[PDB]
Amino acid sequence: IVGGYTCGANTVPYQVSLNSGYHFCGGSLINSQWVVSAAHCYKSGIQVRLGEDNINVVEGNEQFISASKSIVHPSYNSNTLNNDIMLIKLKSAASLNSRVASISLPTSCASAGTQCLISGWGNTKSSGTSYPDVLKCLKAPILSDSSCKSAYPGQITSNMFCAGYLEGGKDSCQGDSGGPVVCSGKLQGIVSWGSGCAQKNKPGVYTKVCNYVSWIKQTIASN
Numbered sequence: 001i002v003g004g005y006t007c008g009a010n011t012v013p014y015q016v017s018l019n020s021g022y023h024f025c026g027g028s029l030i031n032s033q034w035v036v037s038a039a040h041c042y043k044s045g046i047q048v049r050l051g052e053d054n055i056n057v058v059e060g061n062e063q064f065i066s067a068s069k070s071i072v073h074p075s076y077n078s079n080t081l082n083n084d085i086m087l088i089k090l091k092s093a094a095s096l097n098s099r100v101a102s103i104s105l106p107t108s109c110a111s112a113g114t115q116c117l118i119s120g121w122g123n124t125k126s127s128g129t130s131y132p133d134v135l136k137c138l139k140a141p142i143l144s145d146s147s148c149k150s151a152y153p154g155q156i157t158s159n160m161f162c163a164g165y166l167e168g169g170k171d172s173c174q175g176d177s178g179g180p181v182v183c184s185g186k187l188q189g190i191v192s193w194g195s196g197c198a199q200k201n202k203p204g205v206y207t208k209v210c211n212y213v214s215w216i217k218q219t220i221a222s223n
């Protein structure tokens, strides 16, 4: 997260770190046994780390659980990143409490101007790499479809939306991918891609979760 602030330990109880010996992507807990992340964060040997704040120190509240299976969306297109969503089932259910809680799936899509909270352990520099130890937060609004398409002509599908600041300076970045964009307490986006980080007129693009609720529910119900 570039230009964001320290969330404060466990104030984002649904945030998870996907770990394969280092933190590589974020995710969101949606029930005690499933996490939603982005398709391009897929890999084998994933350990989901819940209740984290400093990812380099065991401070207490952490729950480390192995993924039993990862389900990348069947129509995921690695070239366009269209349908960039993945569900991860945990080997055992997580013990939920105040520090580890799930976030709700939306019932409707959000409108432009909605203010949302984006978090993660991704890079904090737009020019260079500086990864933080604790979780960072950023409040950012959803942009209009016209501004998003004007910024990324030909690359935005109906399963994507832009959120951010066109002036640059504040944005999500590498390491944040797969994590949550929460608006009014509902998970509305998944950090997916963008041109650089915090560059002027190049906001972040997020997977539009409202378009996948039936798919998430049907898939969870059959697995």
Ligand SMILES: *[O-]C1=C(C2=[C][C]=[C][C]=[C]2)[C]=[C][C]=C1C1=NC2=[C]C(C([N])=[N+])=C(Cl)[C]=C2[N]1
Pocket: 024, 025, 040, 041, 171, 172, 173, 174, 175, 176, 177, 191, 192, 193, 194, 195, 196, 197, 198, 202, 203, 204, 205, 206
């Ligand atoms: O997410 C990544 C990755 C990556 C993806 C999956 C596993 C390991 C690494 C590599 C390089 C860049 C990114 C990335 N940059 C970036 C920028 C923005 C942005 N400008 N807002 C967003 Cl939303 C998402 C990502 N991911």
Ligand SMILES: [Ca+2]
Pocket: 052, 053, 054, 055, 056, 057, 058, 059, 060, 062
């Ligand atoms: Ca820790």
Ligand SMILES: [Cl-]
Pocket: 149, 153, 154, 155
């Ligand atoms: Cl277009």
